[PDB]
């Protein structure tokens, strides 16, 4: 159909949000005391979620800089 810039950004934000939500669910399960889940997995997944959110923030900064660079020029 199309690239759908809005749709692509929505998909990326959904990926980041579901990653953090899943990491938070895993920490939820661990602290609640469910067997299975392990401490090392909890920390590794929470750090991975932090990395993904940081990537999102960096891309946000670059895109905002791009948009404000386009919109400052005269016509």
């Amino acid at each position: 159909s199309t690239v759908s810039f809005a749709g692509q950004l929505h998909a990326a934000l959904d990926r980041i949000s579901d990653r953090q939500a899943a990491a938070r669910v895993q920490a939820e399960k661990f602290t609640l005391g469910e067997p299975g889940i392990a401490l090392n997995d909890v920390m590794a997944d929470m750090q991975k979620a932090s990395v993904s959110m940081q990537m999102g923030i960096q891309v946000r900064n670059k895109l905002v800089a791009a948009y404000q660079e386009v919109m400052s020029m005269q016509v």
Partner: protein, 209 residues
């Protein structure tokens, strides 16, 4: 749902896209263009653009969009606060009054052009228009409307200019500059009519016809 991750990441970027896109999505295009053209008439700038006309246009647009803002408030914010709505249902809930508001002002032929040059397939109704089509079409319609208002405002001051020039050089005052004689008469005409009320009221009421 979003989890204080992307939330408050889309909020801050929403605010950074605010000043251009949202203020040029609603009004303040027509109001600013009409005031600028009015200010070309009546002589020199003679009014502090970045000071009074911009602020007056901001207040005017607040008042014009107030029903839209109230509908967005009631249909999106309070339902978005804590219960059954989180930033995807909220999007159409908050867009629907805005999309209706922009549809009511679009030229019924700008949508045609932008839909046909975006390869868009047949449109079933007024609600099938995508925001992608409706933004630039609304912008073009708004520019046309602003220029129409602009000529219609220019007319009486053109009348004053031409009558003063004719009287002057008919009387024999061959080459006295008619702009200098006319400028006080332009201000007089625009103050006896109470020009500012007529203008802003007509703009506001035009903007929902």
């Amino acid at each position: 749902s979003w989890s204080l991750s992307v939330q408050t990441l889309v909020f801050i970027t929403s605010l950074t896209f605010l000043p251009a896109i949202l203020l040029m999505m609603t009004s303040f295009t027509r109001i600013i263009i009409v005031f600028g053209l009015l200010r070309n008439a009546l002589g020199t700038p003679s009014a502090p653009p970045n000071q009074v006309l911009l602020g007056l246009a901001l207040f005017l647009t607040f008042f014009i969009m107030s029903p839209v803002i109230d509908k967005i408030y009631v249909d999106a914010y309070q339902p978005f606060s804590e219960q059954k709505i989180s930033m995807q249902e909220a999007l159409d809930k908050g867009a629907q009054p805005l999309r209706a508001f922009m549809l009511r002002q679009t030229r019924e032929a700008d949508l045609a052009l932008f839909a046909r040059l975006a390869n868009s397939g047949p449109l079933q109704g007024p609600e099938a228009v995508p925001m992608r089509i409706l933004l630039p079409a609304y912008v073009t319609s708004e520019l046309k409307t602003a220029f129409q208002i602009g000529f219609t405002i220019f007319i009486p001051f053109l009348i004053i200019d031409l009558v003063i020039a004719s009287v002057l050089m008919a009387l024999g005052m061959m080459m006295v500059p008619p702009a200098t004689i006319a400028l006080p008469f332009k201000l007089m005409l625009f103050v006896l009519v109470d020009g500012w009320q007529l203008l802003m009221g007509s703009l506001a009421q035009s903007f929902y016809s």
